[PDB]
Amino acid sequence: AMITGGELVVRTLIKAGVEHLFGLHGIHIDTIFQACLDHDVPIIDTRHEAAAGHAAEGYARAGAKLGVALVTAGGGFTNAVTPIANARTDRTPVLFLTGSGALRDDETNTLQAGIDQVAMAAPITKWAHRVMATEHIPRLVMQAIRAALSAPRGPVLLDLPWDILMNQIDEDSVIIPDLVLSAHGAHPDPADLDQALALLRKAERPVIVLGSEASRTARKTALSAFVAATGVPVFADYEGLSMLSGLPDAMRGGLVQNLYSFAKADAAPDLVLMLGARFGLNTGHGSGQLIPHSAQVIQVDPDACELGRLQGIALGIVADVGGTIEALAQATAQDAAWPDRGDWCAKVTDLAQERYASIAAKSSSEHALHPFHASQVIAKHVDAGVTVVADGGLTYLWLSEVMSRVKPGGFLCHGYLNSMGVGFGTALGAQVADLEAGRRTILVTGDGSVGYSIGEFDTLVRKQLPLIVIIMNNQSWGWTLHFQQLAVGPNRVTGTRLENGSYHGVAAAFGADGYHVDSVESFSAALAQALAHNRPACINVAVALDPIPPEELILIGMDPFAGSTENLY
Amino acid sequence: AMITGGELVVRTLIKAGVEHLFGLHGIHIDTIFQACLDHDVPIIDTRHEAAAGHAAEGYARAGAKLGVALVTAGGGFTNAVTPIANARTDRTPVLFLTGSGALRDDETNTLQAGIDQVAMAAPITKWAHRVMATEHIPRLVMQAIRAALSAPRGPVLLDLPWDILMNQIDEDSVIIPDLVLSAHGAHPDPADLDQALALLRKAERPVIVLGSEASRTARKTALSAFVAATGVPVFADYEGLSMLSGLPDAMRGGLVQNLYSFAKADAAPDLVLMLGARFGLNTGHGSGQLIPHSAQVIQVDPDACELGRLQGIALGIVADVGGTIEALAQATAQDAAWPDRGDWCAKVTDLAQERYASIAAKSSSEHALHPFHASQVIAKHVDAGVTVVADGGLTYLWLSEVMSRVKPGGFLCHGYLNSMGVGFGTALGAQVADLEAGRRTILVTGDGSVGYSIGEFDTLVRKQLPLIVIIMNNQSWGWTLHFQQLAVGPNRVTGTRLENGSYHGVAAAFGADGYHVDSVESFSAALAQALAHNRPACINVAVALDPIPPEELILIGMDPFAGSTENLY
Amino acid sequence: AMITGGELVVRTLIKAGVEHLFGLHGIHIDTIFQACLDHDVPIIDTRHEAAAGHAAEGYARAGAKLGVALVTAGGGFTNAVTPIANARTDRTPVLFLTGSGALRDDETNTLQAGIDQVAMAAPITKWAHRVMATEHIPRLVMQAIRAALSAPRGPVLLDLPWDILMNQIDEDSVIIPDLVLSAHGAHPDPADLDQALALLRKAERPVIVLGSEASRTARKTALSAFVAATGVPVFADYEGLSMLSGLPDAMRGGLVQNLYSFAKADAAPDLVLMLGARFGLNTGHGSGQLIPHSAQVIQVDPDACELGRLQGIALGIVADVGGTIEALAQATAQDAAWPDRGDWCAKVTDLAQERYASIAAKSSSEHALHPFHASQVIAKHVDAGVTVVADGGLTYLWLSEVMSRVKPGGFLCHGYLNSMGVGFGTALGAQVADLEAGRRTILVTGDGSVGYSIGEFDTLVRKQLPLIVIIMNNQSWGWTLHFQQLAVGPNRVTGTRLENGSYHGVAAAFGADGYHVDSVESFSAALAQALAHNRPACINVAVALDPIPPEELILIGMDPFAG
Numbered sequence A, B: 001a002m003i004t005g006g007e008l009v010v011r012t013l014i015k016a017g018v019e020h021l022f023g024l025h026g027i028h029i030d031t032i033f034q035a036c037l038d039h040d041v042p043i044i045d046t047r048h049e050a051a052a053g054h055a056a057e058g059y060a061r062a063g064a065k066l067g068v069a070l071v072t073a074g075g076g077f078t079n080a081v082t083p084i085a086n087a088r089t090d091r092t093p094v095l096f097l098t099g100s101g102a103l104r105d106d107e108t109n110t111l112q113a114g115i116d117q118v119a120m121a122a123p124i125t126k127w128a129h130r131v132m133a134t135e136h137i138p139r140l141v142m143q144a145i146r147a148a149l150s151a152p153r154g155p156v157l158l159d160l161p162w163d164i165l166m167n168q169i170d171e172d173s174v175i176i177p178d179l180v181l182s183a184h185g186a187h188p189d190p191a192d193l194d195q196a197l198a199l200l201r202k203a204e205r206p207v208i209v210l211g212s213e214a215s216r217t218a219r220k221t222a223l224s225a226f227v228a229a230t231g232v233p234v235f236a237d238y239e240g241l242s243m244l245s246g247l248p249d250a251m252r253g254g255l256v257q258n259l260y261s262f263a264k265a266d267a268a269p270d271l272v273l274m275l276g277a278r279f280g281l282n283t284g285h286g287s288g289q290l291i292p293h294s295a296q297v298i299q300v301d302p303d304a305c306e307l308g309r310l311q312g313i314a315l316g317i318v319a320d321v322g323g324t325i326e327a328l329a330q331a332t333a334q335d336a337a338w339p340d341r342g343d344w345c346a347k348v349t350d351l352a353q354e355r356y357a358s359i360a361a362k363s364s365s366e367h368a369l370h371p372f373h374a375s376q377v378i379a380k381h382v383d384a385g386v387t388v389v390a391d392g393g394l395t396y397l398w399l400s401e402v403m404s405r406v407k408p409g410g411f412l413c414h415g416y417l418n419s420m421g422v423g424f425g426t427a428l429g430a431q432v433a434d435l436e437a438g439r440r441t442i443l444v445t446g447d448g449s450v451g452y453s454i455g456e457f458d459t460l461v462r463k464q465l466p467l468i469v470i471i472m473n474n475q476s477w478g479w480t481l482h483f484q485q486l487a488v489g490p491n492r493v494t495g496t497r498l499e500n501g502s503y504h505g506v507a508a509a510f511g512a513d514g515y516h517v518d519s520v521e522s523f524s525a526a527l528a529q530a531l532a533h534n535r536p537a538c539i540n541v542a543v544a545l546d547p548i549p550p551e552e553l554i555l556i557g558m559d560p561f562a563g564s565t566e567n568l569y
Numbered sequence C: 001a002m003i004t005g006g007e008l009v010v011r012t013l014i015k016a017g018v019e020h021l022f023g024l025h026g027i028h029i030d031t032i033f034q035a036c037l038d039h040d041v042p043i044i045d046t047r048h049e050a051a052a053g054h055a056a057e058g059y060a061r062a063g064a065k066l067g068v069a070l071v072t073a074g075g076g077f078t079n080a081v082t083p084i085a086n087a088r089t090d091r092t093p094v095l096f097l098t099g100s101g102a103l104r105d106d107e108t109n110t111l112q113a114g115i116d117q118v119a120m121a122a123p124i125t126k127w128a129h130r131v132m133a134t135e136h137i138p139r140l141v142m143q144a145i146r147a148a149l150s151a152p153r154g155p156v157l158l159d160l161p162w163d164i165l166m167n168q169i170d171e172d173s174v175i176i177p178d179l180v181l182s183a184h185g186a187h188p189d190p191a192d193l194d195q196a197l198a199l200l201r202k203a204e205r206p207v208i209v210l211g212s213e214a215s216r217t218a219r220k221t222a223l224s225a226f227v228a229a230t231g232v233p234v235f236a237d238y239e240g241l242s243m244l245s246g247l248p249d250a251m252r253g254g255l256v257q258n259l260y261s262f263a264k265a266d267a268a269p270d271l272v273l274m275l276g277a278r279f280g281l282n283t284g285h286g287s288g289q290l291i292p293h294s295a296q297v298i299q300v301d302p303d304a305c306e307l308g309r310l311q312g313i314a315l316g317i318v319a320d321v322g323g324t325i326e327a328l329a330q331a332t333a334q335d336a337a338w339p340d341r342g343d344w345c346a347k348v349t350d351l352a353q354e355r356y357a358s359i360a361a362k363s364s365s366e367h368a369l370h371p372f373h374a375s376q377v378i379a380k381h382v383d384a385g386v387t388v389v390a391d392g393g394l395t396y397l398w399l400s401e402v403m404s405r406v407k408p409g410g411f412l413c414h415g416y417l418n419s420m421g422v423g424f425g426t427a428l429g430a431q432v433a434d435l436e437a438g439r440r441t442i443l444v445t446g447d448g449s450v451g452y453s454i455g456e457f458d459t460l461v462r463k464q465l466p467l468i469v470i471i472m473n474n475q476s477w478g479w480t481l482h483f484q485q486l487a488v489g490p491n492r493v494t495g496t497r498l499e500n501g502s503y504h505g506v507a508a509a510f511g512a513d514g515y516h517v518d519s520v521e522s523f524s525a526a527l528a529q530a531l532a533h534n535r536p537a538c539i540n541v542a543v544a545l546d547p548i549p550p551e552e553l554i555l556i557g558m559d560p561f562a563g
């Protein structure tokens, strides 16, 4: 039979294992919506293309698989640009399918046409391309999927002109290729692997740090077997934290940020094995505050430019992170036993403890709910059956202090782009993936950031996605207000106050359950109750603004744990 | 004294006459917020960068002046991309100021950095540039303003690296240039002008069509004097419609779409004077449906590629539209004796009438409020003291039928990009400009499109902007649903229903006045009352979905006014 | 009948008035070569795409019309990039037609395909676009031509996929549009024009400076009538110099660089009317060395960002330069009352004189032929019947000192890009245009720069283009060597010597007439003889390296006329 170009798209996605799409309808892509309808492939349709974009990101990250976003020509594409950029930075594998104007109508000042969408996306994608012929669709879709999924993972843009999608062709005349692309990543040269293990055995206080590429491959069995065998404690940036959840307690270092205080306590690591973590925002750049200059660093990353980017390293390996973990588990399952490391792991715990307890002791909820105390209420409920997504500024910095000591099913935080607002879309897509794994999704966001995508409460009710949305409400763009006060002056605060709005009332108006709470008592009760029902909820938590999370000070070169501190201004 | 780079920005803006900015705070652009604070330049801060972007568009269009938008690095910029694209298409003069990462921190995988923001904006701006030195700021800002304001007007992107803004400089060591750029546009060669007037005198049924460039220059006095002298009826696309408001009734043709039916009534124009209207979506492309092939066309546009783009023309002039209008008023005040044209203007009116009355007769509100009847309620209140902004799909197509016969102060509709959602931001900025002119702003949007920027109700309350928001609510993405039914089949509707949500309840939760109405009685009453108070309001109007506006059919090559019609698909 | 897409291209070009193309063949564009063959439209085929590119630039500038370049997919396009960039900077109207891979074969790692040619050209063109359908060809070609010819003039790239050109369609089913685009540019608002004239009358020592846009419009009659009426002296950057050739001697200021010394002699202009000249390399940037800070400046340019770019100005007008000249001629033929200015014009001449005579007196050919003396030999032959093209570094700086006082038919020099090597292609295309106007073309280039395109001697012989090529040979990349020795040190010279090669012997080997000369006697004789025959020639002129032209020192902030 004759079939549309939109039909060729969907047949090809199906063959690649895609089971959900995220998008927002337009006539230019209707052929694709119609094919999905015929094939029972759900499309999670949102109220903003950005939210669809971020949802496909969230589905990808929470599910360790390909996310797919689908947007129409013109405004559709331009509204998807923030998700694309965020995926590029975060190394998230998303295929963005966009419509564009018909090639037949090129340069007619017509509806939604006239944007060079590929030129716009080229600098924020692994690959961006416009399809010139209907027969090409299946190979170019499959090619795009291979680009997205190979290491380092990333976003890909495929532009599908309206006429190219509406054109019909004989199904007997075009092949739909399979997805033939090894799931097992490339391993290191054995010589390099041996050299790494030689260094690791010789080392006195070694640590491992995991990045995004370790979550994408999700090689949990190999990882736990490798750590079980060597005894080495493991830390991670935010993307890598859920990979620590299946490790024996005594070797979970938690978030890499805890390494801060080690130098001051004469316990700086002398070896660091970086598995797909990068020198950048989460690892203290080239400063040495987390990853010491004096330490022998072994870095594994699929992108050779990332190796020793900001610091000298002892050994640099271009390989897949997953394949590397696998190879380490192999090499390690057969050789002599490894040195003890029990004393070193006890140290790591003890320091994570001191940090936590120092914050606990400093935090009061006497006059208003302290953000730390609010974050602790959430942690009580974080097991393997929960995915936590984090947005906001101060909100997530506070939340980060409770996360090292619990074992989340998933944990999705900001990446280098720090784009406020992305959390809602992200969490929605995470929740889609999580229903399939029987997990529950919780978004912890700030009163500012929730504003960006607050329409998606509609989408939760319509699609019966039981996401819980917790709003740490400090009546402000909090982090930026703090900058204004600290970096400029007491009364130079301007454009950062949000002294208005009933966010639970908004959610109620869209049909979600709305709670407003202001204390530890009331918040625990409300969260328990929302977790008990399989319904979407919004909990508006009134929270203090003044308190300064330690990571605020650290990310501008000040010691939050000393007595005094110089302001670099 | 020493002053920041952000300070140089603001001093330069001030000197160009800018009195408001639209934006959303980030640390990377705080220097600019601080300078505005010192100089009492208000920044209208929104809940989404897109809304700020569109608000500067709206301020520009409603005010016939430069709009300025201000966004931070990374996500700030990516969230502004849809406004930039829309400005490019609509020929709207907006200066977009964006932060970016410090040049000192280039390539350190740091916070919000690493997006080639200029590369992304190059293909949708008149000019995009990244400032390399603090001393350059004033000349490059002024240069950007000149680029934006010269014909054809358009958006400009100026990227200001964080370190460049924070750097301090002796004020005595850098000059702030004036804005030296003639406000009077260039005129046509007199030979060409004479040839145009020769043709216009010779012609039997001439018309004038105005585009966006005629609103930007706003030469209302010259225009009315030229029309007074020649007797020629004047039509306009959406951007040009407010320029007809000061003309004698007998010569207001209204929206250019009314030309549709003229051919069928043996009254096709034999001359068309296109002043900055373009061959494209609003003028029936190259089809000849509105601007006949047989007619002698005289086209004036500042962009030479636009001339006879899709059709042959008799005479093509590259000049400013405003200067051309001025020149015509001159030439025409001299000779001053022109043929009658009363019969022809009566015809034009009569046909506009027939159209209107045919729709009136076809429209029933017996079982649910018909969108035409809803649009008529709004028209009762459209005088020179109102700016109407329009968003949605079906919603604005219906509204277009009542607009020709009233005289709005401003009227801001979609352009070629047809980007749903832009109206809220647009209207907000329009309202800022309109307080200065004592005008009231009304947004007419669809239940889908309001979702995109629904957070900006917060902004209305915080900033006490008394915008009225009317939501034509048909429980759906209406236009796309119609496509699905018409172009594909009865029960191929999918991803276009929005059978949920209390939008007035949302507005109430943000502190705006909320009304829900479902009849002509109740809606008139609610609008009167919201117009009487100087407060922001949201009126949720329940409205029928089935009715098909004539422009739906016309924009896909079908006759809504015949009896039968062939489906092109 | 059925016709190819290449045929639609050529029919459309014809209708726009195009009479020559410059290019180099490939299978991807053969359809266009075949159509040109049928319609007797010559294609000047070169040995390098760059030379074709520059030749279309040269044809455009010398002829004041559209130049058209034609290159194949892949390497064809990448080789044309330098011409495109140069046209963008110099505001030269060129349409670049490039092939690319078939849309049917997109992403098959096939022959010459896989370069995003539009992305590459976007940042150096007025417009760059890839044609998606054969029916679109005539409107998009014509649209591109309108883009190129409207102010400010510039290059346009139109990418034509192989399958799109080979496709056939019914000729009756697509319209070839006319070129409907006013030749008369837009004029200033009269209020602005009156304000300008008010200023010009009030001024005590006014001058006019012409840029490229004045050559493109070539409104010589209006210009001469405006100057005749106001008495104001006129200067120009290199592109504008040929527009001074038809003015009365007493009002020719010559090259704008002569304004240097006026401040020192207490005679700095107090008003400057900039017609399409820009603040930049040729006008002393924002320094005030040429266009004084104390002067009231009136700037006219079609590009509003150019107005007061580097300096404050009194009045800024966005309009076509040609239309503005026309409008000034009109306003000025009415009122008819203007102040004398004879004393001021005498001053201008007298300062141009002092400069020239100071160089003359300083220049010796005792031990080897001095470049100034070589430039003087050339000037003897520069009348309205000659186009001079200039390449090289030191070579053109020296040559510039003899050009103000002669009246060339055309004069084509470097622009802001200063791209060495472009002169050969440029001059070749200039010569094509000039045969039609009965003018002779002379290229004055350096021994370095001639190397870039030396294959085009083949093209001269094959196409019987009687271009004369003069090589100022100082055995070196001269200007850069000077930098090395003066900015860094006596014996830090490295990578700048070219102590090898018989360039006249090369030309002989390609069939051109070759001369080698080393004195004033021998050079005059050789140039006379080459100008007497209607044959292509190469004169290799041995010339001194040490002498420092004044503009070398000026372009790095030093006074060559002090102490």
Ligand SMILES: Cc1ncc(C[n+]2csc(CCOP(=O)(O)OP(=O)(O)O)c2C)c(N)n1
Binding pocket: A391, A392, A393, A394, A395, A396, A417, A418, A419, A420, A421, A445, A446, A447, A448, A449, A450, A474, A476, A477, A478, A479, A480, B024, B025, B026, B027, B072, B075, B076, B079, B112
């Ligand atoms: C898209 C975007 N806009 C603005 C910023 C700048 N920014 C950094 S933190 C912050 C405040 C967010 O406030 P909120 O979400 O309420 O959480 P809180 O700071 O109070 O924890 C802002 C605006 C950004 N990073 N991204």
Ligand SMILES: Cc1ncc(C[n+]2csc(CCOP(=O)(O)OP(=O)(O)O)c2C)c(N)n1
Binding pocket: A024, A025, A026, A027, A072, A075, A076, A079, A112, B391, B392, B393, B394, B395, B396, B417, B418, B419, B420, B421, B445, B446, B447, B448, B449, B450, B472, B474, B476, B477, B478, B479, B480
């Ligand atoms: C940003 C964007 N997304 C999607 C579309 C496709 N589209 C065109 S009309 C329309 C429906 C708008 O519905 P609504 O705003 O409720 O107005 P209605 O047609 O129902 O009156 C859509 C989604 C678009 N043009 N732009």
Ligand SMILES: Cc1ncc(C[n+]2csc(CCOP(=O)(O)OP(=O)(O)O)c2C)c(N)n1
Binding pocket: C391, C392, C393, C394, C395, C396, C417, C418, C419, C420, C421, C445, C446, C447, C448, C449, C450, C472, C474, C476, C477, C478, C479, C480
């Ligand atoms: C394409 C290019 N490459 C290099 C340069 C740098 N450059 C400036 S002047 C010059 C020397 C030119 O030598 P020549 O043509 O012999 O003239 P001369 O200065 O010796 O008279 C060079 C190489 C340039 N401007 N363009």
Ligand SMILES: [Mg+2]
Binding pocket: A446, A447, A448, A472, A473, A474, A475, A476, A477, A478
């Ligand atoms: Mg907050």
Ligand SMILES: [Mg+2]
Binding pocket: B446, B447, B448, B472, B473, B474, B475, B476, B477, B478
């Ligand atoms: Mg709707």
Ligand SMILES: [Mg+2]
Binding pocket: C446, C447, C448, C472, C473, C474, C475, C476, C477, C478, C479
């Ligand atoms: Mg040399």
